[PDB]
Amino acid sequence: VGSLNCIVAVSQNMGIGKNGDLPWPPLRNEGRYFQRMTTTSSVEGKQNLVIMGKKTWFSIPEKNRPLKGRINLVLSRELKEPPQGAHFLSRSLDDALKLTEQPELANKVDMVWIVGGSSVYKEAMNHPGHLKLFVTRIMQDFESDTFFPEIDLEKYKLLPEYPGVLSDVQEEKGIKYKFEVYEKND
Numbered sequence: 727v728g729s730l731n732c733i734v735a736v737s738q739n740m741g742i743g744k745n746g747d748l749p750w751p752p753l754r755n756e757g758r759y760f761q762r763m764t765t766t767s768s769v770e771g772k773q774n775l776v777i778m779g780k781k782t783w784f785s786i787p788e789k790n791r792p793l794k795g796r797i798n799l800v801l802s803r804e805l806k807e808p809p810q811g812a813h814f815l816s817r818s819l820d821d822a823l824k825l826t827e828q829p830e831l832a833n834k835v836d837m838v839w840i841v842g843g844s845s846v847y848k849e850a851m852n853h854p855g856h857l858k859l860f861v862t863r864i865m866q867d868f869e870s871d872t873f874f875p876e877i878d879l880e881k882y883k884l885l886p887e888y889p890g891v892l893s894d895v896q897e898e899k900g901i902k903y904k905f906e907v908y909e910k911n912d
């Protein structure tokens with residue numbers, strides 16, 4: 727089991743969602759990026775595991791469920807078994823990393839990506855150890871009902887560049903966004 731990473735797209739108001747949907751109109755290349763990063767494994771015969779809260783799971787269009795080519799795990803304390811389409815269910819983030827360490831998954835998983843929600847990100851981010859945050863800054867304000875937790879710059883360092891991550895401002899549907907990579911080790 728390799729790397730623990732968080733991936734999120736956030737608006738200037740730090741918004742991540744609205745009535746279980748993204749706060750901005752769909753961005754085709756931001757989405758290809760999201761798919762590219764979470765799907766690519768840096769080891770042969772290995773696949774990445776994607777961890778998400780129950781609401782995040784339900785917010786993905788059903789035809790896109792489960793996320794293909796990745797092991798999908800849902801986080802819930804109320805669910806008795808994994809939702810239709812999902813592979814695993816854990817009652818906590820710690821319980822989910824533990825399972826990574828079971829001979830079950832131990833030989834099959836490379837990277838572990840946290841893809842949502844606020845609740846899940848906030849605990850990953852407080853988790854001790856090595857962690858990277860792949861943040862897409864959507865350079866405008868969007869009405870939102872769910873937000874990304876504040877990033878502690880005394881703990882997270884913005885990287886100057888990262889292989890396979892564009893460093894300049896992109897634009898889609900008249901919306902400007904840029905990709906950022908933050909790293910921590912505590």
Ligand SMILES: NC(=O)C1=CN([C@@H]2O[C@H](COP(=O)(O)OP(=O)(O)OC[C@H]3O[C@@H](n4cnc5c(N)ncnc54)[C@H](OP(=O)(O)O)[C@@H]3O)[C@@H](O)[C@H]2O)C=CC1
Nearest residue numbers: 734735743746747779780781782785803804842843844845
């Ligand atoms: N812009 C982006 O990058 C992303 C945007 N989104 C959007 O954000 C919203 C989804 O948001 P969010 O509300 O934060 O909800 P979650 O996706 O994180 O779901 C909340 C539920 O998930 C389970 N859960 C969540 N965290 C934990 C934990 N740490 N341990 C155990 N169970 C946990 C619980 O289920 P229980 O009650 O069942 O125990 C909890 O009620 C939608 O708006 C979605 O579209 C989502 C992901 C990324």
Ligand SMILES: COc1ccc(OC)c(CN(C)c2cnc3nc(N)nc(N)c3c2)c1
Nearest residue numbers: 733734735757760785786787790841842862
């Ligand atoms: C799998 O295709 C989709 C299609 C529509 C979706 O929102 C409805 C989703 C939801 N959803 C999981 C999603 C979409 N874009 C994202 N971008 C970044 N940078 N980080 C994320 N964590 C993220 C997550 C996934």
